[PDB]
Amino acid sequence: SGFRKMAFPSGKVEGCMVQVTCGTTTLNGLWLDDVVYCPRHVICTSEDMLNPNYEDLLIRKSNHNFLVQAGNVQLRVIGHSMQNCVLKLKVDTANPKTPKYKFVRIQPGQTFSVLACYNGSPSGVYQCAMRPNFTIKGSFLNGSCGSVGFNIDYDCVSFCYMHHMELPTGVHAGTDLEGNFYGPFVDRQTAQAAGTDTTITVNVLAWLYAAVINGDRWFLNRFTTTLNDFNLVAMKYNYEPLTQDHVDILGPLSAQTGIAVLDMCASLKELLQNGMNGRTILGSALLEDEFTPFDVVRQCSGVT
């Protein structure tokens, strides 16, 4: 028992982190097979970030201008190409620690682990959610760019995020591993609006089921609701609308606990309208939305 904000073991990803330097800019790269992936802004100076023309900036760079260091050894760069907002540096050596991997574009509301890195070295790992507005609330300092987010399914690492930018609001923005930004963001130093963020309703419900499994049951009530009535409340409290697709993925948790999805929706409705009344759920005084129904099933069953 017990329920924690658990990250995936980061070993398979640590073995892929390298340092990439171009001119005076240094950031993190991801070495998979004979390719190193990093944010394309490694070719910019601070002044270039105001309005960069990446095609023109990259044209002035050659393979020998990209310094790639893995641990203490230097990698020989034999090719370079830009794909959307990432640079792909072809190296003459395959990473011997390359795990089985995939590049995946996650959906808003999905969770992943971030391995925060500086100078190609890992400092920490944490679990977070891709917000419905395509930002992440990470912990990233200067030099953290190129740090990646991922999920693991037994021996396969599905890379889903690469860190690029911190918005003036202190929230974070990045790309998938093909260099496409999540959200409307561009890699320029210009104030960019992240949309209205909402609470990931399906995740909160999954976390309420995780609380029932671990013994926190005070929030259970004698009521029920409909998907329509619940969504009227969710919209009022800036929660994402719950669909039958969301109800479907809550099925295993509904089965284990014997608490129907709409009954759990009624508990969530009362918590939204009345608050916690100074009480806690799984050690939190607010409604947690950073665990998906899959995360709750995985943690409660022991998937290694």
Ligand X SMILES: O=C(Nc1cncc2c1CNCC2)[C@@H]1CCOc2ccc(Cl)cc21
Each residue 134-163 as x (binds a second copy by CB under 8 A) or -, in order, gives: ---xxxxxxxx-------------------
Residue 199 touches a second copy, criterion: CB under 8 A: no
* Other beta carbons within 10 Å of 191: 7
Q: Measured from the CB atom, is 5 or 188 closer to a second copy?
A: 5
Site size for a second copy (CB under 8 A): 54
Whether residue 61 contacts residue 40, with contact meaning beta carbons closer than 8 Å, is answered with: no
User: Helix (H, G, I), strand (E, B), or coil: what is residue 30?
Assistant: strand
Kindly tell me which of 1 and 24 has the beta carbon lying closer to a second copy.
1
Give the nearest distance from C-beta 171 to a second copy in angstroms.
Answer: 8
Binding site for ligand X (CB under 6 A): 1, 41, 49, 140-142, 144-145, 164-166, 187-189
- Footprint of a second copy on 27-46 (CB under 8 A): none
Of 105 and 298, which CB lies nearer to a second copy in the complex structure?
Answer: 298
Residue 41 CB, nearest distance to ligand X (Å)? 5
Tell me how far apart the alpha carbons of residues 28 and 111 are, in angstroms, rounded to a whole number: 22
What positions carry a catalytic annotation?
Answer: 41, 145
- Cα 47 from chain centroid (whole Å): 29
Q: Does 179 bind a second copy (CB under 8 A)?
A: no
CB of 60 to a second copy, least distance (A): 30
21 within 8 A of 41, measured Cβ to Cβ: no
Q: Tokens 């916690």 map to which residue?
A: 276
Q: How far is the CB of 139 from a second copy (least distance, A)?
A: 4
Question: Under 8 Å CB-to-CB from 9, ≥6 apart: which residues?
Answer: 152
The Cα-based distances of 273 to 158, 174, 198, 205, 261 in angstroms read: 38, 35, 17, 15, 18
